[PDB]
Amino acid sequence: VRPSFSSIVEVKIGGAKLPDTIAPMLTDGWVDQGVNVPAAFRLTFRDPYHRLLGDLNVQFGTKVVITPIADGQGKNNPLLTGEVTGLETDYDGTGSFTVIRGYDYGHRLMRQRRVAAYRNQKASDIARKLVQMDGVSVGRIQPTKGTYAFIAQPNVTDWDFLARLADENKMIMYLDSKGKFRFVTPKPSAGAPSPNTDGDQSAFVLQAGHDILRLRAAVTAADQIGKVESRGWNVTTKKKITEIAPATTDPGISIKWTPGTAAGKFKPGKLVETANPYDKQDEVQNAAKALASDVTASFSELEVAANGHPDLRPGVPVALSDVGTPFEGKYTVTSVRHHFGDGVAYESWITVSGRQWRSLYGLASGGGGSDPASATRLPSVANAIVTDVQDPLKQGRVKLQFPWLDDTYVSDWARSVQMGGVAGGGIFPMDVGDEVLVAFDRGALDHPFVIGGLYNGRDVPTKSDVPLHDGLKKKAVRHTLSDRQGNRVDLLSQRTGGRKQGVRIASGNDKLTINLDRTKTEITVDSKGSVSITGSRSVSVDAGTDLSLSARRSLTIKSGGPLSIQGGSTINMRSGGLVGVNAGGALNLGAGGAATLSAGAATTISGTVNVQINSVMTRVIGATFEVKTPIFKVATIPVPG
Amino acid sequence: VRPSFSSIVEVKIGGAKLPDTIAPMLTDGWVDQGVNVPAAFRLTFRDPYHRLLGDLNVQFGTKVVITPIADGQGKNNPLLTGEVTGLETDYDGTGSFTVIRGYDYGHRLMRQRRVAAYRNQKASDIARKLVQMDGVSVGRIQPTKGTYAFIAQPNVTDWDFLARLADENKMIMYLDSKGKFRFVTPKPSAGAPSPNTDGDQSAFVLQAGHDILRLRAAVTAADQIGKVESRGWNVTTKKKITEIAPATTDPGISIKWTPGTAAGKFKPGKLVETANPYDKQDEVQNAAKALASDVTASFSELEVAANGHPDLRPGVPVALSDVGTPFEGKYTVTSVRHHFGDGVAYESWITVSGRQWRSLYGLASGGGGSDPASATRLPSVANAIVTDVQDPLKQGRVKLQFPWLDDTYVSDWARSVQMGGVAGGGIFPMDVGDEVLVAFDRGALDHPFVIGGLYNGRDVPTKSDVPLHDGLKKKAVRHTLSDRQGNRVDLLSQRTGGRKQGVRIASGNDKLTINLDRTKTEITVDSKGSVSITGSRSVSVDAGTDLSLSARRSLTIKSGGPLSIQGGSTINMRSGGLVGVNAGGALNLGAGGAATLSAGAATTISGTVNVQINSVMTRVIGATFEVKTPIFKVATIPVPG
Amino acid sequence: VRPSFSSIVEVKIGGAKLPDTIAPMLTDGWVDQGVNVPAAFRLTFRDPYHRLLGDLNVQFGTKVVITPIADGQGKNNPLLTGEVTGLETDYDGTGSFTVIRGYDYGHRLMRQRRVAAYRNQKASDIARKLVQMDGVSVGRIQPTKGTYAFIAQPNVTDWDFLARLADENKMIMYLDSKGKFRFVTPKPSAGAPSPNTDGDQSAFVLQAGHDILRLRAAVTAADQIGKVESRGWNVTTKKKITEIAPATTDPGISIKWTPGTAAGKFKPGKLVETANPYDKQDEVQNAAKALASDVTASFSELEVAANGHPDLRPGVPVALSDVGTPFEGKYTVTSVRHHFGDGVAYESWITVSGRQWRSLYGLASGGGGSDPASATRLPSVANAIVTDVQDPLKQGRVKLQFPWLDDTYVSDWARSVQMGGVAGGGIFPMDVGDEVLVAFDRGALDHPFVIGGLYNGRDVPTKSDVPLHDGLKKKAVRHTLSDRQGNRVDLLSQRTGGRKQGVRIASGNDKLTINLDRTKTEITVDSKGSVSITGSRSVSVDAGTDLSLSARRSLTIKSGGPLSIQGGSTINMRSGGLVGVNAGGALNLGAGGAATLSAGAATTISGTVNVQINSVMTRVIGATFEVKTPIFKVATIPVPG
């Protein structure tokens, strides 16, 4: 029937049934099963002479199975198979008891604290991999809605990472009777029999006064809001992505009243989540749905201590009837406490609290939730080593490799801050061995950012002509901007020593240099190589007060057009053995004063032309006047004096 | 008198008096009224057959009024007027009770979670506007001492924001009986009935043994320090602003002993606050006063459970007398618990604990651990969108819009970090639509800081002729510094492909380029336009080994002073068409060897002066010699040979 | 013997024995001693008329000595010399009790909150200085393993800081009976009486059922891992330092089972610490050993309430016998509780729980959280003022003094991040007076990092020419890179106003400037000084369409070799006054057309050589023809016409 006449607990340790000489020694039989934390075994035997543990040879690390038997139900279907973890002995004054404590076959997930990174795997794939890796048989795994680009395990316990993953995906972290892992969606509450049933023809119906020893049901509108929004940033388009989801319905609870009424009956507020990064529409939609489920899970909180039945496993629909106006209907169980003890028969505490750990006190072993000191809430910045540069987008994006976290974690691409903008800007890409400063997006490890490279040992900067600081007043003297080899621009200012001042656009080998030197107001374009100054429509209009073009070997001046030497004063045109002027055309001279044509060797006045010597007077002072042709047209016969 | 004979609870639901058929059912009446958190109603009726909620037609959101009546006091002046929030049913083994839970008319402030920014409004103005937004009638609001400039509400429950503001301003939120907000200063403890009074002529005097059912009074010097300082940074002057305030007095407590004695009797310590940013003297002084009040509020902790009186409202002075040496005097109440229950008449728990909400549990429900991760202490950095760059100071300050927080929050000016210094440095302003990386001052949202622009999709860097990485080892090859436009300063170094090395300066049109090219040692000054090299005291002293000046269509050389062409070897002065040395002054030519003046058309020697040919030999050896004028001074008559 | 016949509590207040008229009034004597928190008295007298405190003249800050006496043990050995801290009264319905709470002398350490930096001192030296400054006598201090460079005190209580040091160094802060501070290693558990000794003879042996009133012994493998590793970064070599330490043994516990048996019987996991920066091998080794000890301290948790004995001081070995298989052996006590009360004799509660504070509830006052709101986890960044720019390595580091933390804290060198790399990069050193934006390593204060200088009031004397923003749409117009004094490179782009575009490499005083101007396709190498353009193997090959070389007061062209003026068109060679060609060598001329040599004054044709005139026609036409020597070789006699 619904209650029980006699109830027994059958416990098997190490695969063998409990010895007949030890079965009467058992007193308490506690089993606390939940969907948020691993279930707990507490088997308390009475050992007045302190000899039990020396006979069972029980050492933690042994398989133990606990089954309840109420009437003829529960002979098959063992309740929970797990592992003995801790031992306790209590001399409380009412009996020197020996307590064996156990955890679920799968508690090892909480035992292991891991760091890792998973690339291009679905959440169900992550669950499958982690579980097997931990030696736990896989039951049924439900594929999740969307894939993840890159997940990082930020130094957390396996159980907690998987638990949050299930929370974000609106799942349940089920661990069934035979120790099989399960990642299953919540069962709909409608499945349970109608409360209008007789209440005695099944074991999933609770009637007020029939088999409800203790009852605590609460329906509240503490933080029920109709709309919940989750927001994120899209970098491939620079878009503010957002998702608004309703919180007016809930699958786990059906009590004739919905949270939509709670939202309507008060002012229409809204809730915002600003604690996790998001990138794609799928992730934002999933987060919005998860937050809506979280908000709607607090609508009803139920806790019934009943005579029980061994079929009250977690995650099953249970109908609550004849309680009142807002408390009828169906619920989905979340935690079940099977209790055997002094003066108490087989007791079952069914607690429906959504995904919260209301059981074992809301605060539980903390402040209502774990706040580890080695969590993912990384404040400020850290240092990292670059491992990859092969960005498929050529935006300077660079992979990282944290050296204080793990030797196999290399993260994903991280955008690096650069002095650019909306319409383009300069880039200073990093090498494959730099040590760069890394910040984080809202503290999350999944989204690192690169600020710039640091300076440490074995990475001293390239040496320069002048030191970093000088002078008694001890101010900055040089402000260097440089590449990784020596192609540099220097902005230096000094009043001591060499008194170097100004700007210096140098080269790697110092062969090429543009010195804007203020110490002597001198522009020095120095080059141990070729020089080339060119224009298109006009050439350098050189000016000043002293010009000089002294180049060895050769000097060629070409015009391809009109050429002019205005001068303005004496033009001393020296030579070194030859002066030549080509027969370009009508060559003409002139002078406002004298005109002299001297030489050292034989002169001549050539030309197949009508030579002439125009003048108001002409006097050949030649020591000898020789003509080898007849002389004509002389006005008078030659006369001396 | 002081104690009472008969005590009643008058509760009105929905504005109508409690029905006569329901009044006997009420058993438990609990009212918990405090000055730190909203008060609570707990009305527990006995409903064995579970039919109450189906007859009263109670839906949360309905108005409820609770009044106590002790003797002939309290018929008027209702105690509290609030709203039903949650429902609870209990089967505890002592009756099937139905519980209605209520909160204050103004609990909605804790219900709403908001993001917003307030500009140039006083704290009292903030409270008034905000409360009027939430549909709560405004009582008396006391004007704030100092005004603010920019307050950000960083995704917080509204009541918590208001409470932090009130704690900053040494204030109190006593919602009145009639549900009216009161932002009021604490009532001074001096204005209280004298302790040496008869103890029976007033309802504000408690005597040990007269009516004090339970007493718990503690006076401690756990963390009493005489002086407390608060410090901040002033940016308009670079000033370390500080305020030291005393903690030797406290308005709320007067127990013949002051915290000054506690501070003096121990070593003279000091306390510092380093958790919030401050900018002005007013804010720092207010923070120092608030911290001093907070420290002095822990001097005395009092908890008296007495027979009570319906006039024991919060925020009223109460005189405690005949208790001992240090426990006499007057206090100001902070929380009051009115209780009706099984085997208990009307009882009043008066608790004085200053700010500390130690009521119910010292840990309350979080062990004094308020870390809701409501994105308040934003860790590390985040991304933001620039909205305003006006800067009334021209220092590059920029208004920041956060895309993951709100669509209407645009913040105040943020001092972007610039790679300069104190006496002047280069400025890189950002456009009106950038995406920048912003840190925060000690995590507070009120003081964002811009680190630099980021790179995302649809904002690619300016295209360049050479790729960002090349080779098999493929180290960094190019280090570009550029404006949003094409003006660039490239520092490039390559070993493969085109083997481009050196420094480049480009104007974006690829016309004006300065190439310090190291692959072939060269300086190239290219420009699709005019060139101009100028000096003041001397001109470019050009040098090298192969000079060339070849500009088409024009070449003008001007001196305005002495001109010299030293040469040193052959000077081939070619020409085409015309070559004329039009010497204004005295011309003169000389030769170390021969001298030749040829022509093709006609050779002419001119000059309006006596021409002269002078040398040992002046032979013609040409052709016919014609003279058209008399020949003179011939020594010998012409003779061949 | 082991139990006691009659037990008394001897208390001395103010150095004088408790008065005879007050000794019967004492009711409750409670002492709580431990190695994690200061010891406490909770003495409780019965004062029905509330007059005790007015006669003893007790004022907190008075010395009090407390001792238990069970049989004839402890008559001259005091248990705890401390100071009265807080007074307390009670009307609990069972008497009007007066309670005097006292704390051990070490409470002063928890009473002071300090900010400071300690320089080149061992941890033992730090403890000695802290204890001496706080007026506490120094007992025995054990020198620690290694020294530290700096240890900042990030606004923390002295006691918490010293406890952190003790936990780091595997040390305990037990305070002895006389009140003398000592900093001691835990006593080994092996140095205890054999578990199988007589039992009654030794006062350090507890037997199940003999004198164990209450017992709670727990042995668990909740988080037992064989190996624990600690990781850190070395900057003098760029190295990943790591230390793996075993957790298979523990000095404090010896119970026939070791944590190695817990680790082996499960999967071989590992644990990592990622919350504390580390620099040297010694520090990493110390951290690994400390974490291993912390993990192994949770193997056994013991709580024994026994018949009491005054020799059960903290930090002494105690042998636990005849309990079972895994619970025999020895323990090192961690906290002791001496209790005298109503209907209760002298009770001693021994608690062995490692370094954890499992003594108070399960979460003390604030378990899990214990995050001082004013803690060391600095989120995001802050502002700081440079105080020293020197560097023993010249890598650009700098010391930073914080203006919101302390006036005497200047920190260590911070590796400022700037655009460098593995093989060298540019550096911008910071001046002494700069204000820089400083991040933090993992939030820890000990490792600040400088990002870059900020801008504030009277901090931007760049004094640039063009404004930082112009226009209606008013995008960024200028991108300045400059030096503290003015030597600058500007990348400016405008469309309105003066319409300036291009690049400008300027100087401090603007005398020297290289303008790449794009509004007018021009290169302006302007300089109020000398100019020098030089080459090595070839000279500037100037080109374009209009050459102009116009320099006043001088113009010198030198070749040192062949010189050529190709020309190609008219060559106008004017002269203000005088012109000349030197007698270099075989000077020659030529003309494709006419040839004219005119002058305004005395002409001549010099040359001490065989002058000649050659042509088919030699028509020398003038106004006369004078020869000063005889004519010869005339072909015919002169003839008119």
Author numbering:
A (entry chain s), B (entry chain q), C (entry chain r): 2 to 642
From the paper:
Bacterial contractile injection systems (CIS) are phage tail-like macromolecular complexes that mediate cell-cell interactions by injecting effector proteins into target cells. Using Streptomyces coelicolor as a model organism, we and others previously demonstrated that S. coelicolor CIS (CISSc) mediate a form of regulated cell death, which influences the onset of sporulation and secondary metabolite production in response to exogenous stress and unknown cellular signals.
The baseplate module comprises a heteromeric assembly of the proteins Cis1b/7/8/9/11/12. The symmetry transition from the inner tube (Cis1a, C6) to the VgrG-like spike (Cis8, C3) is adapted by two layers of the tube initiators Cis1b and Cis7. (a–f) Local resolution maps of the CISSc baseplate with C6 symmetry (a), CISSc baseplate with C3 symmetry (c), and the CISSc cap with C6 symmetry (e).
